[model samples]
Structure formats: structure tokens, C-alpha cells
Target chain A: GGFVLVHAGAGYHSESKAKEYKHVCKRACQKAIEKLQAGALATDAVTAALVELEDSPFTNAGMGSNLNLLGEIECDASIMDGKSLNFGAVGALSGIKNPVSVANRLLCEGQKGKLGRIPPCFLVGEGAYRWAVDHGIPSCPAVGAVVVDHEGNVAAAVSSGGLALKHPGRVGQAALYGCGCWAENTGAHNPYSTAVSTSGCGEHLVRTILARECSHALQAEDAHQALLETMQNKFISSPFLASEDGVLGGVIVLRSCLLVEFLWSHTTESMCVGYMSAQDGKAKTHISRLPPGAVAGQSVAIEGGVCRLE
Target chain B: GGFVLVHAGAGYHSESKAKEYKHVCKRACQKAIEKLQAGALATDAVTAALVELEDSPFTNAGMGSNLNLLGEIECDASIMDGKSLNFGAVGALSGIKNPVSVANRLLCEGQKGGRIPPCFLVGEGAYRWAVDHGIPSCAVGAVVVDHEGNVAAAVSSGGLALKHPGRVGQAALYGCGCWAENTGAHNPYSTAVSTSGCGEHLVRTILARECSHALQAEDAHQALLETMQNKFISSPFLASEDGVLGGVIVLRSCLLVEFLWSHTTESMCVGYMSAQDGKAKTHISRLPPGAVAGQSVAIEGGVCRLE
Candidate 1:
């Protein structure tokens, strides 16, 4: 009934490489569509999309991710399921190819053991990576997306190799709950429920908990407008934001009565997004290189029917 | 106008040595009160109390802490200042004795520069940063008291003995086990909190944040009690205590209050002191110490509102 919306990354990258970034995002969106066609849950679709970004050499996630001060790839990823409010994440993981898969496995395993002493979430340096090896959850670039299944279930996921030259043992917003990604079905439970995934400055996102703040805003306004206001008021307006030049980006998915909608906003020079909805009848992707504040963002509806690859 | 409330590590330690736990708790409380007398703020006073707990060989923090599976010591600590709404924390730190001191230093320094990243640090980098900046190590336990009585909370742990290598616990995760906030323009009326217990279990509930939310209810006592009896001890995900879960809650408000409880059959250790009470008190009872373990609501702590 719906599609997945994604971003390549939200920082200031090279202007000349815009085409490559958008190309990867277009491929990632197609991968998610393939999963949705196979009747995969939103959780699986988002995971599949991120796996594409992780595999691509152009993204700053898995294979070509930014290195820390130690010049190591300590990856972070997380997945959230809206139906049960379940969350799983891996922080500072290395030697893995698809960390999102590992996060998905953690989500499933945590649900199975309802009474275990183990926390539903897991993180660490070598400890998390070791568990990934034991469980075979591979490893990603810094990208995020929110997807909706025909059943109205929503899920979100995000991944990052972290800031280039960051300190060793530094965990960024991508792996922190409420900071990186969050998903929950509204009206089914709390009114303040929605799915959100974010990219940009990790510390600024952590301080504002961009995903959670935007999701909570859904309680009072339209998902698209709420996201716009959240980006403008909470993130762009904060003095904590190093400079207006700094950016924070996010994609939000909201399921309303008989309609599934996706929205996105960013404070950066450009954001590469690709989407294919049942109603659109065709797959479309673009990189909006507009000014930071003037770009109000874009939205499309999932009308109904099967989607085809472009 | 307020009092400092504190707890020794909450777990099934040697009951036969209960007197020793009580003795250390009393000394910790006295140290905190001394800070108040010297006109130190809640942030400094609570840190002072934790230093005493860390130095004691009888507790499971600092000197006598449990060794990780690799037989090494990894500690975590956090501090929150209420007025400025700033938070600082460190996790999985080694080669340090007082992590709370480093966390406190992180709190101060993070505010001085507007462009720096968040104050929360982890692992080797956090340890190196401390050495580079000369933050004395040593630490456990938690306490809160309120007014121009602002709230300051801290949690430190050497982690569970035999924990997986590189395994960080609740002590390192902000809002999972420890949280603190001064009354602010965003949300005023009360400061938040920090806690100690089963690291895994506490992290799941985000107990520090939950307890802070509960304390906001009209009746702070019932709010805390109901939150514990229903939300924590009876959680579907936390069916067994297994000597792993126990927590202490302290409030520094107009009427300073504290309630210590545990999920296991074991009683939690606590100590209390106030200028008005004129003496330090402690509870080393066996089995859960009913409703009021050590310090109940204290209207006599002699608070002087900063405003």
C-alpha cells in the first residue's frame, strides 16, 4: 500500500558528487520497493533499503564510511517497530558489513524473551561486534528512511560510520533511541505516535532528540507540517546548533485514515530522496539542491495498487 | 532547606556484614552534609557523598568493585545540573578511581564552549580525556535533594562481575539509569533523578526517566510507590530479581523525601542526614525495609530557597 522514503546523508558534501548521491538513493528506494512487493513488513523494507546504502561505495555508511580519529570503521545502526514499540541497536560495531540486519535480529530476539534480564537494547565496542559475529548480523552509510506496510505497520531505521575524525568510543545520535530513529503507529495507541529517521550533526540530533521531537509533534499537526515546524523551531532555532550553516535532516512517515503519507525536511544544501508509492504508478527520485530554509520539502500519497520499478 | 539522601550498592552482599554497610553509609551522609555546611551546591554535595562511597572497601564500587569477565575494572558516571539543563556522563572508563569527578568536570566544561559536542564520553577516549585534564577518579551510589535547592544526581558502577568484555551498563547510559535536571524554562517545578540497580533491568525501563515522571504526580510518595510496585518489580520483561535488581530514590524538594526499595527478597542499604535533624541516620535492616527505609519526608531539613 505504500513506499519507503530515504536520504543519502544530510551533511555538506561535494557539490560535484550530487549525481552519485542521488543515484545511490534511487537504488535504495528501489530495493525497498522490492521488499514491499514481496509482502515484507515495513521493518524489513527499511532494513533492505539501508543495506543497499551500506553496500554502495558512494555512501558514508558501511564500506566507504567516514573513519574516526583512530581510522577505524565503528558503525552504528538501529531499527524500530511501530506495532509493539520495540527497538534494537548496535553501537560502535566493526568488521561487519550490514549492521541494520544485526539490529533487526536484536529486535526479534528481544521480543521472544519477554522476561529475560537482558535489556531489550544492546550496545558496546567489541562486545556488540562479537555478538554480531555470533548471530551473523552483518553491517552501513549514514542514511535513514521510514516505510509503511499495507497492514498499516510502520518502521524506521538509520545507520552511520560516524563523524570523520571523531574520538574513539564516541557513540553518535544514529545509535541513540529517540535521537536516531523511532517508529510507532498513531491512533492505535498514543496520539503522539509516528515514525522518524534522521541524519546530520550527531551531537545536535542527540541534544534535541530530533526523531522523538518530530514524532511527538504529530500529536497536534499534520505529519508533513509537523516535521517542517520541528525542523525549523527545534533544530534550526537552537543555539546549540553550532552555526546556521550546520544541518539536521529527517524523513517522517505517517499513516492516516485510508492514506499513508511520507514527508522529509533538511537544513543542508541538498538531500537526495527517491520514492515510489502505489498511487504514483511510477518510481521517482531527485536531489533537491535548494537553499536550506526555503526548501519546505515534498510529499506524496500512496493511492493504491502495485508499484513497478522505474 | 534540604537534605542529601544516599544508598550503598543495592544487591545481595554479605548480610552478616550489614553493620559495615551501614557504617559506610553514615560516613557518606556526613560527608555530604559537610559540603552543605561549606555552602557547596547539590552537584558538589552529591559528588562529595559518592566519593566517600567509592573510598570505602566495604562497598562494591571503586576500590572493592567487581571485575569484568576480563578481570578489569570499567566504571561509568553522570551528573546533571538543574539550572542550565546541562548533562555530562562517561561510560566503560578504566584507569580511574573517581568517574563522578570526571563526569562533573565534563558538566562544567561542556557549558563553557558552545561549539563542542555533547559532554557524554565513553571507553578509552573518556579515560584519556580525564588524564589529559586531571580529573581524579574514584566512585557509586546516588542521592538527590532540592531548592535554589537545585537537583544533582550521579550513578557509578564497576559493572556486574563477569560481565562481557567491553560491556557497558546502565550507569553509562543517560536517562536509562541516571538522569538529573534543574527547574528550567522548558519544564519547571521539580528537578529529575538518578538510580542504581540491575544494570540490564534498569536500562530496559529507563527507570531514571520513569521515576522522574512519577515524582511529578501530586503525591510524590504514592507516585514513586506505584511506579515501583507496578512498573518495575512487576514488569513483564523483569520477572526475576536474582539478586540483580534493587534501587534507591531520593527527592530534594520543598520537603526533602527518600524511598528505598528492592525487587529481590534482600533489603537495600541507605543513610540520611540534615542540618535540622542534627545527626546522620542509617538503615541496615534485613528483608525489604518496608515503606520508609531510612529517610522519609523531611520537612525539617532547613532549606534556603536560592530565589
Candidate 2:
């Protein structure tokens, strides 16, 4: 059996458009489920999910992404494979229809074995766009997705248009390793196989390395408690981010054990997430929001459930 | 008093050009010492050291940086301030004389209160921002600890010879090229680290920050030993087919200031100096006997005392 989890983003999702956000997330999950059902690897499935999220007009990624200071739709995206520990990313790229596809292509190219020359794991700007075009890769753009395939391999991916009115060349956590996404399979030292994806303020996420931290926390016996403590200490109260007035970010985590577990946590106003398993009748979606009177970046909301693989 | 340590690069240094490499390392240390003598902060001293290294014709940075497949000199550079935890970097940049300066400018700009500007920029966008902001381009690598106990690190590279155009090396990536942090009363050790070598290997392991975190252990030496072995040599992220390649210079400040250099490459040229030292001390560290380049590793360190 296989499992998939995805998020629209970890910022303020207006109640007015909550339905659209939730629907997009469901569609992303469905997209991944389709890939898994077709015997696709976790990396491919996660990429499929991200492409759906990026295509959505409601998300801050891909087709309807926020414009930069120059009013251009430059985007960032990255993908990581747990089995091989391979990662590929693109930043500040424009003129692409699907940014995640380009990122995925980079990962695939890197695995072909370096022939006397090291293939670039990361590319940026017009150079990245040109490379995509030269390689016949389509572009669009992030949200994020994580998946655990039937073989138990895991993968994570993220894409974003970045902050609205931001610098044109500004690269966010989405293009950074260990910030936007992380995935690792069970090893001798690590008891849990896990994958993580993040959204929110790119700077905050980059500083705290929230995605990698969340994956590490999932190795704990109580993933829920671990994530809470990490989000509080490593993020909201991190020394690296003492200057920030308010921290905003969200994470969607998937860990494999006897049962596959999925968790979502955010220090933001709202985060829309969806999950599905091969055994499920349909995807389950939720719009998790902080309690009334609680301030974003100061308080967090955490929720999760486990699914059994048949 | 302040202390600074620098490395020319982690890859093979030919015997014919060893003197030039060693000379540049010494010059970098002297440049940093001058900044420290002027009562500059660790961040400033580190930037000073990197500028000297970048200006050297023998080094793979700035003036004589390696050219990309397109025969253009696009460089990558970054700097970090331990006190503020502020970091700035530029990737695939061209035409700038000092890339490290632009990186420092970015770090300084990010520190200003108001809207959060970008801490990392790349390509034409980065070049345009630097020009608009009146900044120069430049790297090599350096780590420093100032009298105030603040630590700082910076790195620059011409990137791999004949690399793909627009390829961003580890030097411009967060946590990959350099890291500095003052743990203060909470942790006994404050650490700073700078890396040089193959960009891909460094990025895969996030080498610089990994070294900084490893230096925080109770046994700093043993911590780094395991980190290099497990995180770099045996990293699951890297394919076994590719030779593990990289080097790092680390500074751990506590009761005494310690400087350590390690590399898996054939040779790594390094230099160190303190405010009290009349001149800098330079060395070309090479792999031990029976060890192979990109497979075996070597480590050496020294302590500097300040009254």
C-alpha cells in the first residue's frame, strides 16, 4: 500500500476561500494516489502532487503565484528522495509552466551518474530557466507534498512563488535543501522512515531548518509531542530567529512504521491539508486553524492520525 | 584580541604552486589581523580576509576565478555573523571585483529593521542588486573570533572548472559553505566554520553547518572526527561511485580559542594569526601516508592564547 499527504500552504487561508484551498489539497493528494496506484516511486508520486498544487490558482505557487517586486512570477522548487538521499532544486526561475517538473528533472539527471563532471544539484535564475528550456522541461510552480510508496521509500517536494512584492532574485526555503523538504528511510541509527514539507515565511523556515527538524522529530516515540516541542523551541523560540516579531510557517509530516502516520502543524492563522491511502475510499481534507484569540506566529495548531497499510 | 584562520582551497595544490598558495593564505591572515587591530568586529575581519584571498591570482576566486562552460567567470560567495545570525550570499554572479563584499552588503542590508529583504540572491538579479547598491564582488574562505567573543565565517568560489553556467556552488548556499554561532551561557562552546572543495559534496552533506554543530560537542575533536566520517565519507546522500571530496576550517572559542583544519583532498593550504602574533603561520596540510585523495582524510589543529 501507499500513502500521500499535501498542503496548499501554511499562511492565512481566508475563510471565504477555504473551500478552494481544501479542494486543491484534495486534488493534490488524489494526483499522488494515482501515481502510486500506477506503480510510480515515491519521488514521482510526490512530484505529481506538487504539479497539481502548483496548477491551482488559489495557491501561492505556479500559475497564480504572487508577483515579485518586478511584478514577475519567479518561482522556487525542490525535491528530495529518501532512498538515495538525492536532492535537486531551482530558484528565482521564470518562464516555466511547471517548476516542480524542472526540479524533478534535475533530480533525475543527477542520478544518471556523474561522467567526469558533477551535475548541478541546484540552479537559479535565467540560467535555470534556460536549462529547463534546453532540456525541454515544462514549468509552472509550489505548494508541497510527501508520499510513502508501497516499497516503503519516501519523498518530499515543495514549490512557491515566494513572498509577494519580494526581491526578484530572492530564493526562499522552497529552493533550499533541508529547509523546504527532507526525506530519509529507516537506517541503523534512525528507527523511523520519514518525509517532511514546509510552508509559510521562507526566511523563518530557512533560518530554523524546520523541514529537516520536523523529519528528525518524527523519529521520536510520540511524533505529535515531538513536533510541538520542535515548533515551539526550534522555531518560535529559536535563537536564530530572535529578531522576528512573529514567526509564520507550517509543516506536513509523514513517517512510516508498522502504521503510516501523517501530521500537520503550523504557527500560522490557517493551513489546509489533505491525506489519502490506497485503502481509503477517498481523500480526507481539513482546514486547521489556531483557536480564537490566539495570535499567529506565537501560537500553533497540531493535528494528525495514523493509517494502516493492508 | 582576535584570531583568524583561512584556507586557499581543499583540492589538490600542486607542489610547483605551493608557495603561492601558502603566500596567499598568509596574506589573508595578515589582512584579517589588520582589521582586528583596528577594533573591527569579527564579521568585518572575516570579510577583510576573504577579500585578500579573492584578489589573489593564484586562488580560485575573484580575479582569477575558474570559468564556466560558457567561458564566463561566475562566482559564488557568502558571509555569516554569529552575533546577529545574519547571513547573505550571491550565486552565479559576474563582473564584480569582490563577491564577498556584495555578500557582506547583503548581510548588512538584511539586518536593517523594516521589511525583510532577501538574504540570498543570484544571477543577473544579484548582479543588478549589487550594482544598484554600489557593491563589489569576490571568495576563498575564512573564520574569525573577535575580542567580544563574536564569531563569523565567509566563503567564496569560482565554482568547478567548466561547470554548467548558472550553477550555484555550496559557497552561496545556507549552512553549506559557512556557519557561525555564539551559544553564549547556554552552551560552553561557540563555533564558526568555513568550507572549500567540491560544491556538490559539500551541499549534499551541508558540511559547514554540520561542522559548526559538531564542534559544539563536549569533545570537539571527536565530534568533528565522527562528523567527517559519517556525514561526509559515509553520507547516504552521496553516491559511493563519486569520490567524497571537501575540506573545512573550524574555530571553537571557550576557555581558549582552537583552530582546526581537515580535508579529504590531497592537500589543503591554511594559515592562522592572532592580534599578538608578529606574523602569520601557514601550512599545507596533506593526506597521511598510504592514504588516497578524495578517499582518506587528515586533521590537524592548534590553540591560540590571548592575554
Candidate 3:
């Protein structure tokens, strides 16, 4: 487990919270590295990382996330797998802390042909959450953040107290099925990629299946065009999506080699996604957080420096 | 060649501009179809219809369009060819009664090719007034909204007459490349799409060169995907290209078909790309604007039903 990350949610909240974010990130990162070291598969790394992050409230993900209208914290999220066309996602789930974990579990747990092995599939809404619990995930408080289990598996969850004063049940995009996250192995010659759970628009994003297709496209070498295409259709009256007034949308991107990037573009407040890369060929590990900027696009790229020497 | 629509200009100051809206819509429709009888390309037909509408002060698109923050009427307009991919656009050209016409002229005007025919490219304050010969086209200001009052193709234009200078510019999507993406107005496959003014807000309606590729995408599905990709990215950013805090229309199922079922959405425009299987069987037209709720979503198809 060797995940490294710099979180804005850390010190701004508390020391313990910061350490917790660091500890979790490390453990998650460590497990991911271990999985790769032992050849556990890239998808395995994603599951491991999410299991820990889902428990932190400072990160706007899993447990104590911001709420939407009606006073409820509507969780929004997505997961994509580059290896298999399989995708999994969940949105607006209350009670449970980390939905990303569940999505990955679904992918790993579900069977394709009775051989007990099916490429992961994408799931959404109450249905996805219900599946997680029915399959036996103990429910947590409305802001339930972490739910680490006996299994080495880790899930990334995002829950909100809703907005502090709103009603309840306003689902954001963190847990929503499609647009939140994605996973990919990229090929021996290709770049593996994954987009973790993070974002605010549930309906529009979900309907878009933005995360689902985007990550696949990214891993498949079509990320830019795919994302561009997705947005053109998603936002109307215009070919572009907007901060229009103040709708905030956040996204995280991770690649195989040595890079992890994110985009946090919103108007009202800020939504950030942090990342930590291993120190393979680089010798040192680092943490970075992408913050909202005036241009409405918050993108940060961290390097790992692994060389192939073509 | 056939069409129907409306135009709301800076001159129609009151909320009661409904009468004017209806009138422009009817005239736009009549003029388009009239030209269709004489055989003109859809792009030309649209250009013909708009030049007439722009001439009137009732709609903000052309001549009578309200002066921008600069206190001058710098016009911008764009036209897309449903077939050839030829596009025309004009922006910031003052004294031009009809800007959309300039765009059409540019598109029809080609480029310099070695052994190929040279594109009739030309610009400046006065190149050609669009409509050149053997035509009954009115002098814009001369056309009347007839007693019956029927508007034509989709037309929208606005400006900050009271705001500081340059608060706004011509309707053309940054000189005409942006707004004409994936629009197939004449056919039921796609609604006639158009928006002018408050450049900051309206540019949001279309996503420039990216739109160019999508509008020309051979597969309707690919085109729809491109549209979605663009919107997915726009959700969190400020609605800079935000066109008047309203909506848009996709006359028919040309580009984004999956968009029809979303009416309880919001805003003003409506329509869907097209049925997934090229099946026009599902007569889905006039898709309502998305709800002011989460985000506004609309669909457009690049497939030309009549091209």
C-alpha cells in the first residue's frame, strides 16, 4: 500500500484528519504498489485505494460530504475499467460511506459466466447501494465515511451531511453510476488509466455516463476526444458545459506510468481531488491537490518518471 | 428551403414581444418554403430567410439589432451547409444590414487550390452584399410581416444597450466558426438552431471547431456522443457562452436522439437527435429546455433529413 497525496481538506480541517488522509492514502497507495509488485492487477489497486479514502470526511468524499438541495448530501460517483469494457457506478446512496468500494467490489465480485468471473459492470442509484448492503455491507451514519473490512479490499466512498442546512437525500454525483469513476489496465504497450469517484452533477453526469465512457476512451487512447464529445452533448443551448452560475464539478484522472491528474471546475465553492504516485524510477513520493482556478478548470499533473527508453 | 420561425431583437423591449415573436416565426417559414419552390440549397434557403428577418427591427439579429456596449451595431452571423461542410460566418462588420448573409457568402466562396477551382474568398467592409443577381429578395427593411403574421426559421439576438462598451458583440460565433456546429434546421431530423448576441453567453450554445467535427460526423451516434462530451466538460464552469440564461431548439432528430425524452428539464429550446436506429418513426420534436434545476441539456443531430 503506497498511495501518496496532498489534500486541501487536511490541515484546513484538523491534524488528525490530515494524518488520517495521509495514513489512508499511504495504506491505499502501499496496497496498490503491492498489488502491482505481486502482479495483483491494476483494477486491484483501484479497489484497495478506494476502501480507505471512502472513510475521510475532509475530502468531500465518503462520510460528511457536502449536501445538495433538500438538505441531504446526494453522493455522486463513477468507476471505469480500461482492461475490460466493464464499468460500475452508484449514486445518491445514503447510510453507506464509500460507494466507490462497492462499485469495485461489484466489478470484482460479480461473475460473468458462472465461472465466477465476469468483466465488471456499471451499476447506479439505490439499486447499486442496496446490492452492496444486501451482499452484507453494514450501513453507517448518514455521513458514514469509512467502512474498512476484514478483507484486504478497500473502497473509495463520498458522503455529505447534505449542505449543512438543507433537507436530506439530495444525491450528488460521487456515487451515481456512470460519470464518477473508471478503471483500465491500458495494455503492455498502452497507458493504463482510471478516474476515481468525485463530482457534483448526478443526473446530468449519470445520464451522460461520462465517467464510464471517458476512462475507457482515455485508456483506449481517446480520452480527449471522448470527453470533448461527452460535454458537447451534456450541456445544452451551448456546445460547452459551464460554471453557468455556480455549479461545481470535480474529476480525478490517473494513468499507469507516473501521472495522476484532476480537473475541479466549479463556480460557487471549490471541489478538490488529490493524488499520490509511487517513487519507482523517481526515488521519492509526493502529494498534490488540484484547486479551483479563475478559468474554471483545475488541472494538476504529477510525474512518477518511470522510463521505457524507446 | 421551407421554414418558420421568430426573431426577438433589442428593439422589441417589452415582454409582450410574443406578438413579434409569432410574426417573425411565420415570416421565416414562408420565405424559406417560397425559395424551396424555386430550388435553393438548404443553407441558401436559411440565409435567404434570415437576411429578410435581420432587416426588420423586430428581431435583434441584424440591421436593427441593438447597439452593443460600444454603442454601435457590429453584426455577426453564421450559416452551416447540411451537406458539403461548407460554413460561412461574419462578425463585427458595422453597416451590414444582414450579417448571416456574409457567412453564407464565405462558405459558398471557396479557397485557392492548385489545379482545383479557387474558393471565391473575399472580405472587408464591402465585398459583396450577399444576394447578387436575378432575385426578388427584398431590401430587408422593405419586407413586411404580412397581416397574418407568420415567423420563419429559428433566430435569436441580444445585446447590452445600456452596459459599458463591448459589453457584447455581433451574433456570429466568434466570427462565425462556433455557432454553426451540428445544426440541421430544415429537416425534422434536426431543428434549425441559431442564437445571437451577449457573445459570452451565446458562444456556450456551440463548442467551436469541436462542433465543426461533430456536425460533420457521418454517424449520427458519433455526432451525439460529441455533443454529450462537450456538455459533460461544461457543467462546472461558468456559463460564459451562456446564451441569455435560456435554452435552444433542435428542430428535428438530426444529431442527438437520446435528448427527446428529457422535457421536465428546463429553459426554452426543445428536440432530440434522432432514434438510435435511424428510425424517424418516433416523431419527437420540440424538446423543451432543461430545468433550471441541475444543468440544462439539449440535443442536436448532424444528419440532414433533407440534405
| Number of the predicted model whose lDDT against the real structure is largest | 2
What's the true lDDT of residue A26 in model 3? 53
The value of fnat for model 3 is: 0.00
Residue A122 CA displacement from its true place in model 3, Å: 5.7
Question: What tens digits encode model 3's per-residue C-alpha lDDT throughout B237-304?
Answer: 11222222322322323322212111112222211111112221111222234323223344433322
Q: After superposition, which runs of candidate 3 have C-alpha atoms over 4 Å from their true positions? A: A1-20, A34-41, A67-74, A109-129, A141-168, A187-238, A243-250, A257-310, B1-215, B218-307
Return the candidate ranking by lDDT, descending: 2, 1, 3
Q: Could you give candidate 2's per-residue lDDT for residues B139-202 as a string of tens digits?
A: 3799999887889999999999988887898999999999988866555677899999999899
Candidate 1 TM-score versus the reference: 0.82
Over all chains combined, what TM-score does candidate 2 have?
0.98
Model 1 lDDT at residue B152 = 74
Best by TM-score: 2
Better of 1 and 2 by TM-score: 2
Which prediction has more favorable lDDT, 1 or 2?
2
Candidate 3 lDDT for residue A21: 53
Candidate 3 per-residue lDDT over residues A144-213, each given as its tens digit: 1111111212223333322343222223344333444444443443354344343443323432344444
Q: Candidate 1, residues A1-310: lDDT per residue as tens digits?
A: 6667777866554668777877787788888878888888788898988898878777778778888887987778888888766778877778889878778877777766536345436566776777777776643227877787776678899988888877767787777777788887765335533678888777677767677777777666466566667776777765335343544554444444335556666665566766666445455666655453453222211111223322
| lDDT values, one for every candidate | 0.67, 0.89, 0.38
**What DockQ score does model 2 reach against the true complex?**
0.76
